Structure 1
Amino acid sequence: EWQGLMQFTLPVRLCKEIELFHFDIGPFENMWPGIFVYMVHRSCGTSCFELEKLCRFIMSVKKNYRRVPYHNWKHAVTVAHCMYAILQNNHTLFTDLERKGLLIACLCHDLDHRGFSNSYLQKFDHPLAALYSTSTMEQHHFSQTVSILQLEGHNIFSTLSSSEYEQVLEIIRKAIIATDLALYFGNRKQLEEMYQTGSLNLNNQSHRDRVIGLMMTACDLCSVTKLWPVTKLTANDIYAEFWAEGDEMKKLGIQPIPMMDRDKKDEVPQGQLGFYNAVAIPCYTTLTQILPPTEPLLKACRDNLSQWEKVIRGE
């Protein structure tokens, strides 16, 4: 698997389309590892990761994603592509070490997801909720990233200074932690405040960490920014995962929240509408304010909102 990927070349028709925000990796499964290498080399250069280490690392990340309906290998590459398009469009705002770190973090941000939420693990006193009190799965995801980095011939960062090693591990840690959707609502509200008061400053490291947090959310949610048919089809995978969890809660006499109750699947269109209004629209709005070249994400999300409004009135 590793050897074959060192000798992979991305077709020239994808070389133009991979740069666009709306790009759907969905149809090119066999090319996803090589698409990630392509995005790294274009963003960071051919020179900086040892190719043998990168391909060994990439194939071990793929193996450590589970066959779950949504939080899977496909989803990892979808989020890395969105970060790539954000970085390309805002390249000089971020440092070489931030581009390295943010693409690896997106690829690794859901490592070993079990198809269960933090609530589930916490309410049902799962061990991981004992290890990790808050941001339960996200801390595990970072723990899994460090473990793969420390396998034989996987340390893609082994050419950095010890100072830069701890810097990229902290960029990765914060970025993976910030995909806790529970943290996003606070983060986005502050950044929206900092934007309106004119206090937002990218050279301020805590401000810089919050803008990166919002980018991670923007990337995590980006299926709502694809063409309508792709968005509709990804939602299937999301509810399949939520509904499987609702079923486990019912077996234990717990009624799930509607979003996880497969008996309430009628109400999906209004569920998506609410998520767009409360979560997705504000996310890409604030992101477009801070990083205006990210506006096509807001446009595509708006197009998918009116599509759901259409569906709600039998169209």
Structure 2
Amino acid sequence: GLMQFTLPVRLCKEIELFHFDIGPFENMWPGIFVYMVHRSCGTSCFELEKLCRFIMSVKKNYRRVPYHNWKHAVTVAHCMYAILQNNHTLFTDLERKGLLIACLCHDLDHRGFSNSYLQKFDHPLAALYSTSTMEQHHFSQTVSILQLEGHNIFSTLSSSEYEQVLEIIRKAIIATDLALYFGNRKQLEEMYQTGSLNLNNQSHRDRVIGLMMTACDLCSVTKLWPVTKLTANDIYAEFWAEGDEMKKLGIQPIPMMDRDKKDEVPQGQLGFYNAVAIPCYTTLTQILPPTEPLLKACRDNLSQWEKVIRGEE
């Protein structure tokens, strides 16, 4: 009740910034997440004992893969934290509750392979969930963990507040399927430019939260250049493992996933920043102006990838 989680001074100040890195000390990540829940939501939002038990079961259900791991989960929750704190008044009490949990849970039981590889391999999950295959699995594991004894962090909500929050989390997790991002941003682009965008319209909020999820999910490109660059090494470690597996099924992998096209990484990063990252944080800055630091950081990292191509790094 009177027990505030605190952090050392450098973390207490920098955790409030979009570019914060959670650091290499795994054992601090739970405490960092609880700190973010308490400040964006209140010490009232969750029974501390249930929350801690939920956090530790979630961590246990992330795997030891180079990129889609427990650190990624907490990184994406921190970006969401930064967005919610910079837009205090735009979000309901349930959305604040739901979205940090959604971000922590959004890649639960990821195996380091794309939806496309699961379909080519003919993995059982690809018969149970024909599109957004891993993302429907992630939401399924989130419901699972919520239903374990002592793990219902939402037990103080009404039947209907409970159903609203699980529906927020479901849509938020589905939206991290990057195949869905393109259409969702196009729609938001038009709605904003024709002034039809209305945050009282539930299906409009849904799209805005979807874009926030893409923004948080991609936030490695919004960090200090050495974080951005070292995170890309983890991303490629997964992509090239998938490419190897693709070649074992007798399938030429896409360039992203072919370790024989290492040389072309800088140009692939450019395509990605131009086709996905920049448009994402641009539309997000148009809809929520205080998130401009993410656009500005993304632009800075594009410019660093351009230097790498020119030989100046």
Q: TM-score, normalised by structure 1?
A: 0.97
Q: Shift of the alpha carbon at 1:27? A: 3.4
1:296 to partner: Cα distance: 0.2
SS in 1 for 2:2: helix
Q: 1:164 to 1:309 in 2, by over 3 A?
A: same
Task: State the 1:8 CA deviation.
Answer: 5.9
How much does 1:10 deviate?
1.9
Task: Trace 1:128-143 onto structure 2 (pairs within 5 A).
Answer: 128-143=125-140
CA deviation map 1:123-167 (0-9, x unaligned): 222110111011000000000000000001000001110110000
Give the deviation of 1:204 after TM superposition: 0.6
In 1: Cα distance, 2:22 partner to 2:63 partner: 18
Quick one: distance in 1 between partners of 2:25 and 2:121? 38
Give matches, 1:72-151, under 5 Å: 72-151=69-148
Query: Quick check: 1:6–1:55 contact (8 Å CA) kept in 2?
Result: no
Query: Is 1:288 the counterpart of 2:289 in the alignment?
Result: no
Structure 2: 5+ residue stretches without partners:
none
Superposition RMSD on alpha carbons, in Å?
1.7
CA distance in structure 2 between the partners assigned to 1:69 and 1:27 by the alignment: 14
Describe the superposition over 1:67-111 as per-residue Cα deviations: whole angstroms up to 9, x where unpaired. Answer: 000000000000000000000000210001001000000000000
Question: Which segment is superposed worse, 9-18 or 133-142?
Answer: 9-18
Is the deviation greater in 242-251 or in 209-218?
242-251
- Specify the SS of the correspondent of 1:122: helix
Between stretches 114-123 and 163-172, larger displacement belongs to 114-123
What percentage of residue pairs aligned between the two structures are identical? Answer: 100
Q: 1:140 to 1:6 in 2, by over 3 A?
A: farther
Q: Which moved more, 1:245-254 or 1:143-152?
A: 245-254
Pairwise CA distance, 1:13: 2.4
Does the 8 A contact of 1:5 with 1:33 survive in 2?
A: no
Is the 1:102–1:175 contact (alpha carbons within 8 Å) kept by the matching residues of 2?
A: yes
CA distance in 1, matches of 2:260, 2:213: 32
- Bigger mean CA offset, 58-67 vs 248-257: 248-257
Q: Distance in 2 between matches of 1:299 and 1:104?
A: 27
Pick aligned residue for 1:231 from 210, 220, 228: 228
Distance 2:16 2:85 in 1: 8
Looking at structure 1, the residues matched to 252 and 54 of structure 2 have their Cα atoms a distance apart, in angstroms, of: 41
8 Å CA contact 2:5, 2:35 repeated in 1: no
Q: Identify which range, 20-29 or 200-209, moves more after superposition.
A: 20-29
Determine if contact 1:5/1:34 at 8 Å carries over to the other structure: no
Structure 2 distance, partners of 1:48, 1:128, is: 34
Q: Is the 8 A contact 1:65 1:73 kept in 2?
A: yes
Aligned length: 312
Q: How far, CA to CA, are the matches of 2:128 and 2:195 in structure 1?
A: 40
| More deviation, 105-114/251-260 | 251-260
Cα shift at 1:301: 0.2
How much does 1:6 deviate?
Answer: 8.7
Counterpart-to-counterpart distance in 2, 1:141 and 1:186 = 22
Q: Which moved more, 1:220-229 or 1:245-254?
A: 245-254
Q: 1:5 to 1:73 in 2, by over 3 A?
A: farther
Mapped partners of 2:4, 2:157: distance in 1: 25
Q: Distance in 1 between matches of 2:23 and 2:251?
A: 35
Equivalent-residue separation in structure 1 for 2:182 and 2:3 (angstroms): 40
Tell me if structure 2 keeps the 8 A contact 1:5–1:55.
no
C-alpha distance in structure 1 between counterparts of 2:112 and 2:10, whole Å: 34
Q: Distance in 2 between matches of 1:54 and 1:194?
A: 38
Q: CA deviation at 1:28?
A: 3.6
In 1, Cα distance between the equivalents of 2:3 and 2:130?
40
